[PDB]
Amino acid sequence: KLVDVGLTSMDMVNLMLGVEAEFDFTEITPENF
Amino acid sequence: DVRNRIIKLVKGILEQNALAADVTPQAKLVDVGLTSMDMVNLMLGVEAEFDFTIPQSEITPENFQSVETLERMV
Amino acid sequence: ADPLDHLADKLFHSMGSDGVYARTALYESIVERLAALITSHREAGTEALRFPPVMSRAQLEKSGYLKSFPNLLGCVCGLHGTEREINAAVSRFDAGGDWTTSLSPADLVLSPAACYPVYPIAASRGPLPKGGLRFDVAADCFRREPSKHLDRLQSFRMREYVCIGTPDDVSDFRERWMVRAQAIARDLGLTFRVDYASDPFFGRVGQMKAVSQKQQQLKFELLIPLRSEEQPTACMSFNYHREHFGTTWGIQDANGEPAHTGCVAFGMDRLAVAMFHTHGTDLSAWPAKVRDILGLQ
Amino acid sequence: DPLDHLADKLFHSMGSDGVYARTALYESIVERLAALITSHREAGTEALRFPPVMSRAQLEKSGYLKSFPNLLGCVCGLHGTEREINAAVSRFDAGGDWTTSLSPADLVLSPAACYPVYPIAASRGPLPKGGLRFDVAADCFRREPSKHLDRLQSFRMREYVCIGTPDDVSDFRERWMVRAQAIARDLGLTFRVDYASDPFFGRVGQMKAVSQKQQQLKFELLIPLRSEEQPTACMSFNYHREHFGTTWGIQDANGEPAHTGCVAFGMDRLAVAMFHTHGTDLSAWPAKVRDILGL
Ligand SMILES: Nc1ncnc2c1ncn2[C@@H]1O[C@H](COP(=O)(O)O)[C@@H](O)[C@H]1O
Ligand SMILES: Nc1ncnc2c1ncn2[C@@H]1O[C@H](COP(=O)(O)O)[C@@H](O)[C@H]1O
Ligand SMILES: [Zn+2]
Ligand SMILES: [Zn+2]
Numbered sequence: 001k002l003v004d005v006g007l008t009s010m011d012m013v014n015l016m017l018g019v020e021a022e023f024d025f026t027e028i029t030p031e032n033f
Numbered sequence: 034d035v036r037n038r039i040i041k042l043v044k045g046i047l048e049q050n051a052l053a054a055d056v057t058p059q060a061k062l063v064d065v066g067l068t069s070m071d072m073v074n075l076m077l078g079v080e081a082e083f084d085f086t087i088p089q090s091e092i093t094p095e096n097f098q099s100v101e102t103l104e105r106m107v
Numbered sequence: 108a109d110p111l112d113h114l115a116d117k118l119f120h121s122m123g124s125d126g127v128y129a130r131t132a133l134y135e136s137i138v139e140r141l142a143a144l145i146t147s148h149r150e151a152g153t154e155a156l157r158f159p160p161v162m163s164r165a166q167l168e169k170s171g172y173l174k175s176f177p178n179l180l181g182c183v184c185g186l187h188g189t190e191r192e193i194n195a196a197v198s199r200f201d202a203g204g205d206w207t208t209s210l211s212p213a214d215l216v217l218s219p220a221a222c223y224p225v226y227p228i229a230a231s232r233g234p235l236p237k238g239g240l241r242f243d244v245a246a247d248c249f250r251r252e253p254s255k256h257l258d259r260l261q262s263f264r265m266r267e268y269v270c271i272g273t274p275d276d277v278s279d280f281r282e283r284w285m286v287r288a289q290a291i292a293r294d295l296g297l298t299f300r301v302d303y304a305s306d307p308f309f310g311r312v313g314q315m316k317a318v319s320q321k322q323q324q325l326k327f328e329l330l331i332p333l334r335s336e337e338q339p340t341a342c343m344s345f346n347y348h349r350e351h352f353g354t355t356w357g358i359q360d361a362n363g364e365p366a367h368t369g370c371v372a373f374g375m376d377r378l379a380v381a382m383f384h385t386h387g388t389d390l391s392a393w394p395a396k397v398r399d400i401l402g403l404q
Numbered sequence: 405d406p407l408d409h410l411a412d413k414l415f416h417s418m419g420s421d422g423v424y425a426r427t428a429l430y431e432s433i434v435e436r437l438a439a440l441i442t443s444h445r446e447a448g449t450e451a452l453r454f455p456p457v458m459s460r461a462q463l464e465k466s467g468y469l470k471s472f473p474n475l476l477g478c479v480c481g482l483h484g485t486e487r488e489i490n491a492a493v494s495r496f497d498a499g500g501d502w503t504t505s506l507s508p509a510d511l512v513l514s515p516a517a518c519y520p521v522y523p524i525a526a527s528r529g530p531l532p533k534g535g536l537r538f539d540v541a542a543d544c545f546r547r548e549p550s551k552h553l554d555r556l557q558s559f560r561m562r563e564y565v566c567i568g569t570p571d572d573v574s575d576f577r578e579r580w581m582v583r584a585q586a587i588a589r590d591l592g593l594t595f596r597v598d599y600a601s602d603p604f605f606g607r608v609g610q611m612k613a614v615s616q617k618q619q620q621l622k623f624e625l626l627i628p629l630r631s632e633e634q635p636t637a638c639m640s641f642n643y644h645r646e647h648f649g650t651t652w653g654i655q656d657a658n659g660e661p662a663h664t665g666c667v668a669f670g671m672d673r674l675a676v677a678m679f680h681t682h683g684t685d686l687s688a689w690p691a692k693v694r695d696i697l698g699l
Contacts, residue, residue, distance in 0.1 A: 001618075002618070003615070003618040003619055007615075008615065008619065009612050009615040009616065009619075011549070011615075012611060012612075012614070012615040013608060013611055013612065016608075016611050025673075027607075027610065028607070028610045028611050028614060029614065029616050030614050030618060033614060033618070035151050047158070054381075062322070063319070063322040063323055067319070068319065068323065068370075069316050069319035069320060070317075070322070072315055072316075072318065072319040072322075073312055073315050073316060073319070076312075076315045090316060092311075092314040092318060093318060094318050094321050094322055097315075097318055097322070098322075120452065120524050121524075121527075122454070122455075122458055122459055122462075122520050122524075123459035123461065123523065124458075124510055125454055125512060126456070126461045127451065127459070127511065128455075129454055129520060129524060130452065130453040130454075131451075131452065132450075132451040132452075135451070135453045154428075155427075155428040155431070156416065156425045156426065156427065157425065157426040157431045158418070158425050158426075158430075159418075159423055159424070159425075159458075159543060159558035160428075160456035160457075160513075160543050160545075161477075161513070161545065161558050162418055162420075162423070163418055163419040163423070166419050168496065171491075173496055174493060174497075174500060177482050177489050177492065177493050177502075178481075178482060178489060179448050180481060180482065181457075181479045181480070181481055181511075182479070182480045182481065182503070182506055183477045183478070183479070183480075183510065183513065183545075183547075183663075184477075184478045184479075184506065185474075185476060185477055185478065185482040185547045186473050186474055186476065186659075190605075190606060193473050193474060193605070193606075194453050194606060195471065196473065197469050197473050198623060200464070200469055206469065206473075207478065207507075207508040210478055210480065210508060212480070212503040212506060213477065215420060215423065215477075215557070216593065217456075217457070217513075224418050225426060227418075227419065228416050228417075228418075228425065231417075235495045237462065239550075239642045244512060247455060247456050247458065247543060249456075249479075251481045251509065252564060261457070261511070262455035262456065262457050279645055303619065309486075309489070310486055310489075358603070368582065371477055
């Protein structure tokens with residue numbers, strides 16, 4: 001569980017931003033996170 | 034002088050756009066049959082026939098009761 | 108200090124805007140009892156409708172409201188642009204700017220009086236039956252007149268009985284409501300007078316529209332001296348519209364002529380504030396007869 | 405739409421989707437539902453009633469624009485000079501556009517009942533032990549035009565709000581989730597309670613919703629009106645953590661940024677749910693339902 005780790009809304013927001021930045025990709029669902 | 038005689042004309046003029054009645058200096062303008070649109074046109078038909086702007090403190094039921102009161106006004 | 112200001116502590120909480128206040132339980136209990144009292148006087152055959160606080164902008168424009176009180180109207184606006192434009196607007200806000208430059212008018216306004224939506228509704232039913240139609244309407248209304256006086260709000264509840272029919276239907280209706288409204292005010296222990304009145308029509312020309320309205324006696328108000336006998340507060344009105352809405356909405360009476368309309372309007376917040384100013388904010392100390400009328404026991 | 409058949413007995417058209425006049429029949433059930441909700445109010449709960457507008461500055465400060473800017477209804481008016489206003493009206497008279505003279509007021513139409521309560525709570529100083537509870541209500545507005553009878557632009561919302569420690573709010577939400585279900589059951593309604601998310605605007609919005617769902621900050625009581633696969637949320641149970649506590653500088657009894665939560669009842673959705681389930685003929689409603697509503 002990515003939420004059990006300790007990631008909240010702003011964390012998950014900055015998380016979707018980090019994935020789009022490290023790789024090159026830009027739908028968004030609970031399953032895949 | 035003839036101010037009163039002209040005021041009796043612009044009233045019959047406004048009434049002409051609808052229907053006629055018995056216009057006298059003591060008759061209430063509302064009992065004659067003037068309504069809000071009539072009274073508005075008349076405020077302007079008095080300002081155009083005397084080329085002046087009526088003050089706000091003079092836009093009153095008192096001054097606009099009858100031709101007689103409008104006469105004393107202008 | 109305004110004579111009503113002392114009432115604020117017990118009746119209202121600040122919502123950060125003059126004329127817009129949160130209502131306490133004490134205050135609302137009295138507004139609800141007043142509403143129930145008015146309902147108890149509803150005539151049989153009167154159709155009850157409740158309107159939301161917004162109405163169609165097209166319907167309000169058609170009713171002629173802009174020609175009369177353009178300065179009082181609250182319009183609904185929203186962010187109707189694309190996702191990009193809306194995100195940019197929010198980003199300007201984040202950066203010290205003004206997001207509202209992205210606003211545009213919706214097709215709704217805040218309702219300035221409770222009865223406006225009732226005329227199109229009546230019109231859709233075809234010609235009026237003999238005797239006309241009676242409605243009981245209520246709405247939270249809005250008038251763009253910021254004030255700190257507790258009897259002059261921007262958002263306030265209005266309750267109205269509306270008559271739609273022949274000129275005789277409407278005059279009979281107004282006559283009976285003027286008698287009944289006064290009996291209600293007396294039962295409520297209120298001090299008041301009834302007088303000819305005019306709406307605050309806007310602009311130079313407006314003052315004359317008002318003169319004519321007074322002269323034609325189209326509007327009475329029940330006036331309660333709250334801060335002074337010389338500046339009393341209008342807590343109810345009794346309005347004759349002649350054929351204005353009938354013609355506007357193509358309403359035909361049983362004779363095939365353009366219907367006349369009129370209404371008796373109760374200002375629920377003004378009445379409530381009037382009660383608290385008159386009898387004080389301790390309900391157990393109110394006159395037993397007033398308490399009885401309102402069903403407080 | 406399956407709800408459409410209810411329109412004739414419940415509503416009259418006001419010439420705008422999602423904005424309807426309410427019949428005596430309809431309003432009698434909204435009133436009974438309101439009274440039933442009141443009877444379940446917890447002791448020590450302060451009742452406030454809000455008008456359909458609130459301070460635009462307070463709403464901005466609450467962060468509404470970051471979440472649902474597309475839903476906001478703002479109040480605008482003719483704030484100009486007599487001359488400019490007269491000119492606006494003249495344009496309208498000629499069939500032109502008077503609305504270009506509009507500018508925003510300092511008010512918005514309230515998008516939820518609870519927003520005005522936080523600054524009010526803040527002004528009283530630090531919270532007592534056990535926190536504060538409010539009973540709030542408002543006619544709310546959301547700019548989402550629809551012809552579906554359960555998706556209105558103007559609708560009545562009733563909320564119980566808890567402000568306090570995480571525990572105060574947690575305990576409060578748990579009590580109300582049980583209690584809300586008991587109410588729906590006595591009302592003869594079919595439902596389930598499920599995790600949910602708010603309709604946050606934008607791409608980033610979608611993700612905020614995913615995270616909200618994962619943290620279980622929002623539950624909804626869902627009633628299958630038009631379909632069991634697309635049920636209608638008639639109540640929500642919302643945990644805001646310290647968002648409003650921090651925003652408005654509210655401190656709990658232990659000197660920490662207060663947590664907040666609310667239970668929201670959609671009055672119009674519940675009434676429509678009742679008429680859909682039980683029909684428009686009240687004499688035929690089930691006896692226990694008539695009883696608990698005081699019919
Ligand atoms: N700004 C206001 N604040 C409170 N009550 C109001 C306000 N404007 C009007 N009312 C009430 O609404 C009634 C009808 O309004 P009117 O259409 O102006 O006659 C009045 O008699 C008052 O009781
Ligand atoms: N557009 C709408 N039309 C009618 N009721 C609504 C609407 N949006 C929300 N509600 C009701 O208000 C409650 C609280 O709204 P929300 O804050 O979005 O959870 C919901 O659970 C619904 O019952
Ligand atoms: Zn009216
Ligand atoms: Zn809430």
